[PDB]
Structure formats: structure tokens, C-alpha cells
Amino acid sequence: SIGIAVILVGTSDEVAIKDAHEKDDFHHLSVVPRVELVAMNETDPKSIITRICDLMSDRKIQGVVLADDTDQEAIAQILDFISAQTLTPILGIHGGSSMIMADKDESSMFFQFGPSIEQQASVMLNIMEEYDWYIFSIVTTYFPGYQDFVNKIRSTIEVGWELEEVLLLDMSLDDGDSKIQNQLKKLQSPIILLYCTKEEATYIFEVANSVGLTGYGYTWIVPSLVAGDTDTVPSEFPTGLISVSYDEWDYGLPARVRDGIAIITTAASDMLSEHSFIPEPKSSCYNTHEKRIYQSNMLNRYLINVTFEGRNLSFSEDGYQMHPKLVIILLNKERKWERVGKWKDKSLQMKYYVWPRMDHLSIVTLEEAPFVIVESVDPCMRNTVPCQKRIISEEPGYIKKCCKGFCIDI
Amino acid sequence: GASIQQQATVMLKIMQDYDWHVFSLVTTIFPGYRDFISFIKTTVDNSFVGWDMQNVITLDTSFEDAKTQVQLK
């Protein structure tokens, strides 16, 4: 009979979520969770404080789920304080409650749905491995999660990877546009990687269009936070922008709500079965200092290992998920994001066998014993050249091999 | 006094006497540049040195430092 709080702010199909709220199979454990859904606005944090205070005082809330539609990281930033200061854990699944901040508190109990910085770096390097582009550069601003990304990529790249330019931009100081334009002259690789904020991204794109380093031969790949919302397209995002976003198309709001309710319920069941005790103290909103006596110290240990009949919804120590589902987007000529490929379980899947462009001449050949030697890829090495073999049984299938020989050397 | 071609020959002699065999060519929109280009092209091809010449840098207007800097780099 645990109390679960669902808060929705912004436009959403509340009736559909309520109908799909009881879409889990929790009859195998005596939990009978109680779920209350309430709508809210994005007025101010203090309103949220009052709402959660009232909810926990009335229904004895042991778990809070927040979903919104804003593009501000402050939501989880302040929700971390509430999660740390209250014994009831909090979860974020969509909207402003999804972007991962720097870190959570030691006493924090707040978790999010999404991948870490390092996992995104790994996926982006997998993309660069898929299509043979090994020359790149990295530029980022002073958002806190920059050192993690830089060190992760450096360690991962430590195949002939060649990084030749790393840039750090501090946009707190104004009148630095001339300095930015001068220091962007160091970029020489065809591909440049960026890690900043949306408005900062627009400013940097203004500077780039001023210097004209984004026309045809240069393509940009950016993390999820740069895009954020597919519906809105900023003013001058160059055509061909590549990014990876959380799969929000095949994973809708009711699915997120069901997953959150299920993980909360099963963590509570694990805590109340393995230790035979469920921490459900007096949910007092006023003077919460005395309400923190019954510190769980093990529900978090049971909140980081959850299976949902196929879905390994385990979480990490920092607060992020372990097995996210990711999708890749591209900016075509008209301002929209297309669905190009998928990444899951360290596997990269691309729909286009060759990346379309925004001289070049194709070569046909055949294997000959001393002159053209073809072999399968490494479960291609140096001094070899990749080659594509079409398979006819469906959609046109190709398999990549490695071709070398006497003629190839010429 | 001498013309542009004689002075250009003297300049290439000076360059040879110090063995600076790698260079480029930067020209403005100042009139008489194409004759200098042609004279240099004819002088290099009949020389004992075998000079290394980079592509010629030609300015268009008062440099905007937008596309001219691309060639200057």
C-alpha cells in the first residue's frame, strides 16, 4: 500500500497515462501501490515545494515522479535538494526532469532516465568508426560536465585516430567575439565536436557563419542537450547536423510512468522482504529534520538493481541508467530531424550503408590471387582498404571486407 | 633605373645565393602583377635550382579577413 506521487506540468495525455497506469503485473508481490496523479505548472520552485509538501503530508508520499516539457536543467538541480532532504526518493523520466546534472548528493535518492556523458562519447566514437572519419577536433564551454567528456574521449582513443585540436571557450566574458573568431582559426580537421548550451550553441554558430567554417566540407556532431526539443529548430543550425537523442518516439510517457512505478514498487518490495522492513516514516513536511531518523541506507542498494521481465532498468551510482536506448538524428535541408540509426548494447546500426554528402569516382574490381586479395574484417587493419560486397537473396544488403594486393598498392 | 623584371632576376639571384629554395607568391590587385607572374614562371623553368613554389596568393580587395585569411593560412 505504498504511496506514489505523479506530477504532470505542461500538455500531456493524462487520461492515457491513468488508463495505462495499471498496466504492470505486480500481483506476484503484496505491494498494492497507491498512485495519485496531479497536474502542476512551471510558475516557480516554491510552488513545487508547497505542492510536494501537501502531497507528502496528505497521502504520505514515499516516492515522487516529475515530468515536464521545459528545457531548463534547474528542475533536477533543485529536485536533488528535496530528494536529499526527504527520505522519499524522487524520479525523473521526461522533459526538464531528464537532463543529467553534474552529480547527486550522497544522501540523494533521485534518479533519471538517460545515458551518461561517457556512454554518449562511446556512441559518438562508434559512429566515427562506422564511417571512416578519423580526423576530428573538440571544442566545449565551461559547463561542469566538460572534464568528464574530454577525459573519457582521451582515454578511449588512447586504429589510426588522430586528434589535432582541442578548444575551450569561456563565454562569461563579453566582447570576446573577435577573440573567438581568431582562435577558431586553429580548426583544421573536417569534423569538429562541440559541448555547450543551446544559446551558446547559437552564438558559436553565429561566429562560425561569420568565419564561414560550416558550409560544405565541415560537419558538426553535438550531444543530446544541444538539441533537446525536436519540435523547435533554432535559427541557423547548419544542414547536416548530427546528434544522438534519447529514444522518446518509441518510448512514450505512459511507458516511462509504468517503468517508474514498477521500479519503485519492486525496490520497496525488495526492501520489505530481504530486510522484512519497509521504511515508511512519518511523512512530515514541516520540520523534516526529525523525520529523517528512519534512514533506509539499503533501499538505495535495492533501487539500483531492477529487472522488469526483459528490461534491465538498473541504475548507476551517480544517478543515471545502465542500459539506455538511443536514437540518432540528422538535420536535412528542411529544418527537421530524421531517424538515421540505432545504438543498443554496444551495437551500432546504420540504415544508410554509405553516408550521403551535402573529385569522387567509384571503382569496380574483382579478386585476383596475387593482385587483389579480399578477407573479412577483424572480429580493417593497417595497409588495407575496406571494400563493400552486395548480397542478393529484400533491401540492398552489403557486407564490408578488407581488400589488398599488388594492384591496390599502385 | 631598372624595370620590374631586372629587379626580379636580382631577387632570385639573392635567394639562390642563400639556398632558400622553398617559397610562395603573394600578389595584390596592383597593376602589372601578371607580367611579374609570367616572368617568374619563365625564369624558374630554365634554372639550375629547381625551386619549390607554393601556389600564388592573390588578393581580391582590402582583405575582409574572412576568405583572404584562408589563403594566408
Place this chain on the structure above:
Amino acid sequence: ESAHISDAVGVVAQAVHELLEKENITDPPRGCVGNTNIWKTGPLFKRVLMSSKYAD
């Protein structure tokens, strides 16, 4: 704390007078009721403060 407060208040006064020398005067909204828009000269005012120099 007696001298520290005096030094801080003097620095604040001279910094505010330095800021008032420039244009684009912005004031915070009432964030307690439906105001989630940022103060636009936040980083600008911090930059104003960084270049501050004192002899008192």
C-alpha cells in the same frame, strides 16, 4: 567582521556606481510567482565586477 563588512559595502557601492555608468539597466523579476526568465545582465554584471579595482 566590523572592518570586513565596511570593506565589502564600500566595494559594493563603487561597483554599483561603476555599473550605473553603462546602459542596459535590468532589474530582477518577481520569481516567486511565475517568473522563470533569467536576469539578462547576470554574466554581464559579473564581468563588470571582475574588472573592479580598489584602493580603499
Place this chain on the structure above:
Amino acid sequence: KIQLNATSVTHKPNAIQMALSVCEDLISSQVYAILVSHPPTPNDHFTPTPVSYTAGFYRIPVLGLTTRMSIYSDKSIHLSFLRTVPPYSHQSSVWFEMMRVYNWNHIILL
């Protein structure tokens, strides 16, 4: 014609209600700077942090006066916080100067 109106807030033992009241009063006041001068807090936590975070929610500069912990030195999280008392890391530079004076190279830092 610039006018200066003075407003200060007192102490409460808690921190959630303290932060809530501080944020509400400062929002209703539309202040430009925030000053905290509590060296001898009975709680050893030394936490004026929520005021700084809420000021950074609107990019409102904060100037510390007492705490010298290096957590506030991190502008990546403390985006709108400053202070006029250097952290203990400057004592490391002082010890480096001492090493320069007495010609000491190998240390045992704990």
C-alpha cells in the same frame, strides 16, 4: 539620485525553511547583492549554499565573507558566487614560498 535601502534577515536553526524564507524575501525585495557573515555557526556544516544556488538561478552575484572552503571556488556549480577570503589552497603557495626560503624539495603530505 541613486537610493540605497537596507534589508537583512535573521537566523533560524533549520535550513529548508531558512532557504525558503530567504528566497521569498529576496525575490520580493529585488536585491542586487547578497552578504552572509556567519563564521560561528553552531552547525559545523557552513552552508550558505542554497542562497547562492537560488541567486544563480537568476545569475545574481554572491560575495562570501566567512567560509574559506574550496567548494565555492568551483564556478561550474557555483556559477554566481565570489568571496574575499582566499581558501586554504593559498596556504599551499605559502608553504611553497617557505620551501623556497629553506630549500626543501621532498615532503610528506597527508
